[PDB]
Amino acid sequence: MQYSIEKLKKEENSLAKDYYIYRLLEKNKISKKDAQDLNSHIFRYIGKIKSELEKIIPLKPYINPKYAKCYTYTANTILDANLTCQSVRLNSLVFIASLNSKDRTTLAQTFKNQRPDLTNLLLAFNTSDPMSYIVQKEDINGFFKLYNYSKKYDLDLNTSLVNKLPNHIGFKDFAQNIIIKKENPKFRHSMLEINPENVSEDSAFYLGVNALTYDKTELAYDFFKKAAQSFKSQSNKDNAIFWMWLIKNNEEDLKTLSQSSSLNIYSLYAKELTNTPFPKIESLNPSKKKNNFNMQDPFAWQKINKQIRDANASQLDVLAKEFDTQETLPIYAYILERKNNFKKHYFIMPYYDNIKDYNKTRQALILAIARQESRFIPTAISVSYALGMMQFMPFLANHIGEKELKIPNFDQDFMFKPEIAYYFGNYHLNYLESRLKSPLFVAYAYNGGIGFTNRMLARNDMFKTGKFEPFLSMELVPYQESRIYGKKVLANYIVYRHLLNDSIKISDIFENLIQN
Numbered sequence: 001m002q003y004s005i006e007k008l009k010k011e012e013n014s015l016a017k018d019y020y021i022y023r024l025l026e027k028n029k030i031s032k033k034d035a036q037d038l039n040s041h042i043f044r045y046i047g048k049i050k051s052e053l054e055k056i057i058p059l060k061p062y063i064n065p066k067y068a069k070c071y072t073y074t075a076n077t078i079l080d081a082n083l084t085c086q087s088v089r090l091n092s093l094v095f096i097a098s099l100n101s102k103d104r105t106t107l108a109q110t111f112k113n114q115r116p117d118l119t120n121l122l123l124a125f126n127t128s129d130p131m132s133y134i135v136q137k138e139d140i141n142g143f144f145k146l147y148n149y150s151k152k153y154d155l156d157l158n159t160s161l162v163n164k165l166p167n168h169i170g171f172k173d174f175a176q177n178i179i180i181k182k183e184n185p186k187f188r189h190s191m192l193e194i195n196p197e198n199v200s201e202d203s204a205f206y207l208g209v210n211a212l213t214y215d216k217t218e219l220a221y222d223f224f225k226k227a228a229q230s231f232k233s234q235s236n237k238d239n240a241i242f243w244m245w246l247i248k249n250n251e252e253d254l255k256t257l258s259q260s261s262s263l264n265i266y267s268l269y270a271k272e273l274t275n276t277p278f279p280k281i282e283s284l285n286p287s288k289k290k291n292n293f294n295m296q297d298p299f300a301w302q303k304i305n306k307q308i309r310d311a312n313a314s315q316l317d318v319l320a321k322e323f324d325t326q327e328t329l330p331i332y333a334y335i336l337e338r339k340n341n342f343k344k345h346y347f348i349m350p351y352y353d354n355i356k357d358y359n360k361t362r363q364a365l366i367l368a369i370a371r372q373e374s375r376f377i378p379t380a381i382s383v384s385y386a387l388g389m390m391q392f393m394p395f396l397a398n399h400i401g402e403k404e405l406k407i408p409n410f411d412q413d414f415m416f417k418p419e420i421a422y423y424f425g426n427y428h429l430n431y432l433e434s435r436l437k438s439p440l441f442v443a444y445a446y447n448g449g450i451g452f453t454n455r456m457l458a459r460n461d462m463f464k465t466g467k468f469e470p471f472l473s474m475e476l477v478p479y480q481e482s483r484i485y486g487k488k489v490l491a492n493y494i495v496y497r498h499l500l501n502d503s504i505k506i507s508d509i510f511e512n513l514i515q516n
């Protein structure tokens with residue numbers, strides 16, 4: 001089914017409407033005329049849909065009309081500009097780097113009283129190492145502007161300077177990136193001297209991972225303990241408490257972790273080590289067959305999803321009842337997950353006839369992936385237009401459907417059919433598992449591609465033998481999305497294996513991750 005640009009224009013703005021506009025663009029069916037009003041019809045104007053629309057109608061915009069005149073000067077004529085224009089242009093470090101040194105000296109004097117930040121950057125670029133100049137001034141705003149301009153600067157930072165960094169908004173991404181990318185070794189080593197009193201949440205956690213890579217186990221414990229105390233989500237606290245346990249072996253930490261209300265790999269592992277029973281999994285069995293809702297209409301899903309997320313505690317109960325049918329089971333579970341404030345564990349198995357003939361280990365992996373990818377919503381669409389319950393990128397979906405399986409009249413929208421999603425997921429999971437084996441590694445490759453996974457596993461510092469392995473390696477997976485995805489999918493997998501009476505010990509999974 002196709003939609004003309006005219007029909008789409010009548011739908012509400014959503015990712016579904018964006019997806020269908022993008023299908024028109026990629027088929028060259030949007031004329032320069034149709035493209036005129038089109039911006040106000042796009043829900044999320046980022047990435048491919050933007051670069052495609054801008055092939056038809058470029059934008060030069062935007063320069064704020066107040067400062068238009070400021071952008072008529074160059075490095076050769078900036079001394080002719082008024083003081084306001086001079087200071088606007090000096091917001092750009094590339095602009096500052098382009099100036100000649102006599103003009104940087106002149107402008108540094110001009111701005112020393114009113115804008116000593118500008119002065120510091122001007123004089124820093126008069127040296128062969130601007131980062132060293134800025135660090136000597138302990139100019140923290142300047143430091144982050146220089147880092148954003150170029151990641152290549154690296155220098156030792158003293159105790160006073162590093163303890164000032166965590167107060168700046170840029171600190172969190174700075175610390176994450178240099179620790180997981182294993183860049184900027186002098187910055188990295190310097191961050192051993194950050195007082196745990198000065199950091200919290202994710203930043204404290206990454207500084208703990210940092211301390212472990214230098215085998216500073218007491219500092220690491222202090223960082224992870226501050227993370228456990230400050231993190232807002234129970235899942236993240238549990239990850240931090242697990243590290244506290246692994247490092248200092250306090251049995252109260254493991255007891256606290258085994259009694260967590262969050263189901264995650266860390267609380268599951270702690271339950272297993274202490275002979276605690278498996279957590280209770282909800283049982284959803286609606287007797288009603290169906291209602292009026294079309295589970296194959298992507299526009300209906302965008303609409304009802306927005307109602308569910310904005311619904312007060314009251315309106316959730318009305319929706320819960322409406323969607324308490326077998327045909328709408330994924331929507332029911334989605335509503336209940338909100339309605340019970342994310343306290344109960346739901347692990348549904350919808351459209352199960354399509355998988356009941358696979359072995360149970362394969363069933364569990366399919367279901368683990370689908371739960372994480374879509375929550376079993378058949379018409380799910382990601383911001384990069386991954387499609388259906390198993391969130392297939394269109395390129396891969398077309399390769400499998402057209403080239404490999406030669407399906408008659410295949411269209412990428414077949415990914416919205418549960419039978420197609422499960423079938424293709426099985427097919428792709430076979431390719432990955434045959435090469436990768438561990439369900440964790442499969443999960444990383446499913447989310448991030450087999451290329452990145454192969455490169456990570458080729459490194460001699462990832463998933464090898466060690467004191468704190470394989471846990472440390474799971475913290476150092478270089479893409480945040482994939483690092484998180486793997487932990488979540490692995491927990492789902494354990495749960496579904498258990499529900500299918502095909503249990504495995506998560507300790508066996510961890511042992512199989514270490515190659516020799």
Ligand SMILES: CC(=O)N[C@H]1[C@H]([C@H](O)[C@H](O)CO)OC(C(=O)O)=C[C@@H]1O
Nearest residue numbers: 382386391392393396446447448449
């Ligand atoms: C089965 C499949 O398509 N896997 C792909 C995955 C997926 O679409 C994502 O996990 C959606 O949530 O995305 C990507 C990607 O780098 O974009 C590559 C994977 O090969």
